[PDB]
């Protein structure tokens, strides 16, 4: 719920709307936002790379018995979305580029 | 010889692993459908079964779960390696289904 205090968080918007928003802010490489998946406790990171918006699914899992999030089916795990974003500003991980600029 | 289950479905593997206790590190290897060349590593972690594709390629024939970053000449070597080391896995393999 802290991700709601983040400006890169757009809550529940469609893929189309996320690509319009990223377009509006100039399709800069590493321009990104995070949003709700249409069908829960799941999210999409929408990221511009080489003038294209790509979409990375972030899925929740439990663990004794607390939720974490992952983009790689649990190989890399995060307590919350802020941790995930902050990680990927510095490390590409599975992404094609760093997260460089917030899409507001 | 135990861990290789020839061909069985994904579900069939989930049921086999299930009825052996859903324990951490409980695992089996199976052939895929298809890719007759392909294989799958069915592994239980947190009472959940996950399935890791094992694909062959050529440089020299090798298998990989991660597109060539980590290579094995055959399935046995991959298994033995992952008894000691996690690799891309969530836990070590230690129990044969």
């Amino acid at each position: 719920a802290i991700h709601r205090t983040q400006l890169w968080f757009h809550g529940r918007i469609s893929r189309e709307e996320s690509q319009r928003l990223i377009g509006q802010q100039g399709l800069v490489d590493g321009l990104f936002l995070v949003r709700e998946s249409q069908r829960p406790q799941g999210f999409v990171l929408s990221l511009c790379h080489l003038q294209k918006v790509k979409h990375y699914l972030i899925l929740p899992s439990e663990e004794e018995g607390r939720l974490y999030f992952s983009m790689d089916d649990g190989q890399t795990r995060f307590t919350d979305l802020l941790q995930l974003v902050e990680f990927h500003q510095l490390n590409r991980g599975i992404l094609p580029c760093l997260l460089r600029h917030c899409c507001t | 010889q135990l861990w290789f289950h020839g061909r069985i479905s994904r579900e069939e593997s989930q049921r086999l692993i299930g009825q052996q206790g859903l324990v951490d590190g409980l695992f089996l290897v199976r052939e895929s459908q298809r890719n007759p060349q392909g294989f799958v590593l069915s592994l239980c972690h947190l009472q959940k079964v996950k399935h890791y594709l094992i694909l062959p390629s050529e440089e020299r024939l090798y298998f990989s779960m991660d597109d060539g970053q980590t290579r094995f000449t055959d399935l046995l070597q991959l298994v033995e390696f992952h008894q000691l080391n996690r690799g891309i896995l969530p836990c070590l393999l230690r129990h044969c289904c």
Binding site: V44, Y56, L57, I94 | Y52, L53, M65, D67, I88
Partner: peptide
């Protein structure tokens, strides 16, 4: 992978 997304990682 995840069908419909751009996730790429060890499968």
């Amino acid at each position: 992978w995840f069908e419909g997304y751009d996730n790429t990682f060890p499968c």
